[PDB]
Structures are given as structure tokens and as C-alpha cells.
């Protein structure tokens, strides 16, 4: 599929890195919150815009969550509640 990897210049795409309900589930199992996705409604795999033409190497070392490789603490993590480890 086309918008899979999380690195958009129109940015709200956490995508799939702690992968369960698309991204983040359960609170105690997959990354801290009960279901906080954001990619599933707005921007990602077949979601909201559906075919956004951008991928560009985001998991380059360690973890993505909600980053896009540029200024690493990217404001607030809106879907996937953590951020970098690179």
C-alpha cells in the first residue's frame, strides 16, 4: 500500500510502530493508552485521504511513534504517546 511509513510534510500520521489497533491499544500492553490512533481517521495506510504519495525512511535506527525525522521532539505525540529514541 501507498501511505504506510510515518514521515509526512502535511503532518498527522503516527502509522504503525507499537502495532495493535493500527497503532496503540489496551493501556497495559501496546504503548500506555486504551485506543489513541489518529492515523485511522485522518492520514495513513487506507485512512481519511487514502492515497497520500510519501514514505521516505522514518524507522532509521530505533523508534518512530509520532516524530517525522526533522526536529526529533515533534510538538506533542498525538497518537502513539512516547516520541523518539534516536
UniProtKB/Swiss-Prot annotation:
Stored Pfam families: Tat
Consequence when changing residue 39 to M: In strain: Clone pNL4-3
Region spans: Core: 38-48
Modified residues (N6-acetyllysine): 28, 50-51
Keyword list, A-Z: Acetylation, Activator, AIDS, Apoptosis, Host cytoplasm, Host nucleus, Host-virus interaction, Inhibition of host innate immune response by virus, Inhibition of host interferon signaling pathway by virus, Interferon antiviral system evasion, Isopeptide bond, Metal-binding, Methylation, Modulation of host chromatin by virus, Modulation of host PP1 activity by virus, Phosphoprotein, RNA-binding, Secreted, Transcription, Transcription regulation, Ubl conjugation, Viral immunoevasion, Zinc
UniProt region (Disordered), positions on chain: 1-20, 47-86
Polar residues bias spans: 62-77
Domain of life: Viruses
Comp. bias intervals (Basic residues): 48-58
Effect noted on mutating residue 28 to A: Strong decrease in Tat transactivation
Sequence segments annotated as region (Interaction with the host capping enzyme RNGTT): 49-86
Modifications made to the protein after synthesis: Asymmetrical arginine methylation by host PRMT6 seems to diminish the transactivation capacity of Tat and affects the interaction with host CCNT1. Acetylation by EP300, CREBBP, GCN5L2/GCN5 and PCAF regulates the transactivation activity of Tat. EP300-mediated acetylation of Lys-50 promotes dissociation of Tat from the TAR RNA through the competitive binding to PCAF's bromodomain. In addition, the non-acetylated Tat's N-terminus can also interact with PCAF. PCAF-mediated acetylation of Lys-28 enhances Tat's binding to CCNT1. Lys-50 is deacetylated by SIRT1.
Region (Cysteine-rich): 22-37
Biased composition (Basic and acidic residues): 1-12
Predominant location category: host cell
Motif Cell attachment site, chain ranges: 78-80
Subunit structure: Interacts with host CCNT1. Associates with the P-TEFb complex composed at least of Tat, P-TEFb (CDK9 and CCNT1), TAR RNA, RNA Pol II. Recruits the HATs CREBBP, TAF1/TFIID, EP300, PCAF and GCN5L2. Interacts with host KAT5/Tip60; this interaction targets the latter to degradation. Interacts with the host deacetylase SIRT1. Interacts with host capping enzyme RNGTT; this interaction stimulates RNGTT. Binds to host KDR, and to the host integrins ITGAV/ITGB3 and ITGA5/ITGB1. Interacts with host KPNB1/importin beta-1 without previous binding to KPNA1/importin alpha-1. Interacts with EIF2AK2.
Misc note: The infectious clone pNL4-3 is a chimeric provirus that consists of DNA from HIV isolates NY5 (5' half) and BRU (3' half).
Function: Transcriptional activator that increases RNA Pol II processivity, thereby increasing the level of full-length viral transcripts. Recognizes a hairpin structure at the 5'-LTR of the nascent viral mRNAs referred to as the transactivation responsive RNA element (TAR) and recruits the cyclin T1-CDK9 complex (P-TEFb complex) that will in turn hyperphosphorylate the RNA polymerase II to allow efficient elongation. The CDK9 component of P-TEFb and other Tat-activated kinases hyperphosphorylate the C-terminus of RNA Pol II that becomes stabilized and much more processive.
Protein name as it appears in the record: Protein Tat
Organism: Human immunodeficiency virus type 1 group M subtype B (isolate BRU/LAI)
Primary gene name: tat
Amino acid at each position: 500500500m501507498e501511505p504506510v511509513d510515518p514521515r509526512l510534510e502535511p503532518w498527522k500520521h503516527p502509522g504503525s510502530q507499537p502495532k495493535t489497533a493500527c497503532t496503540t491499544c489496551y493501556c497495559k500492553k501496546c504503548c500506555f493508552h486504551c485506543q489513541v490512533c489518529f492515523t485511522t481517521k485522518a492520514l495513513g495506510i487506507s485512512y481519511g485521504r487514502k492515497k497520500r504519495r510519501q514514505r521516505r525512511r522514518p524507522p532509521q535506527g530505533s523508534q518512530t511513534h509520532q516524530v517525522s525525522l526533522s526536529k526529533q521532539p515533534t510538538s506533542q505525540p498525538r497518537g502513539d504517546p512516547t516520541g523518539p529514541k534516536e
